[PDB]
Amino acid sequence: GPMPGLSVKLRVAEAYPEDVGKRIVRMDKASRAKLGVSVGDYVEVKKVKSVVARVAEAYPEDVGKGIVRMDKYERAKLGVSVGDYVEVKKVE
């Protein structure tokens, strides 16, 4: 299950072409920090439904944007669209 405690709310952005299929979510360092995750860790992404994904680094162009980049497979399983908001949590 996800770690006990608080949640980071990020906006769903689309994945970069080469990350498609890899069950990866790109967040910036600030977001990674509130969650107490480093790169390589797993997070739960949730909007009633939930998926788990591996944390990866945001691109410099994406630092600060408050987004989480996630591909067509996680987004369909999550039932979510680009521009939607989701809650991210470290996995225990």
The burial of 26, by beta-carbon neighbours within 10 Å (0-12 exposed, 13-18 middle, 19 or more buried), is given as buried
Pick the CATH number of 8-90 from 3.90.10.10, 2.40.40.20, 3.40.309.10, 1.10.569.10: 2.40.40.20
Resolution in units of Å: 2.1
- CA–CA dist 54, 27 (Å, integer): 10
For residue 15, count other CB atoms closer than 10 A to its CB.
19
Which positions ≥6 away from 33 have C-beta within 8 Å?
none
User: The tokens of 46 are what?
Assistant: 């949730």
User: The tokens of 84 are what?
Assistant: 């939607």
Amino acid (one-letter) located at 23:
R
- CA–CA dist 19, 31 (Å, integer): 19
Start-to-end C-alpha separation, the chain: 6
User: The tokens of 32 are what?
Assistant: 């990674």
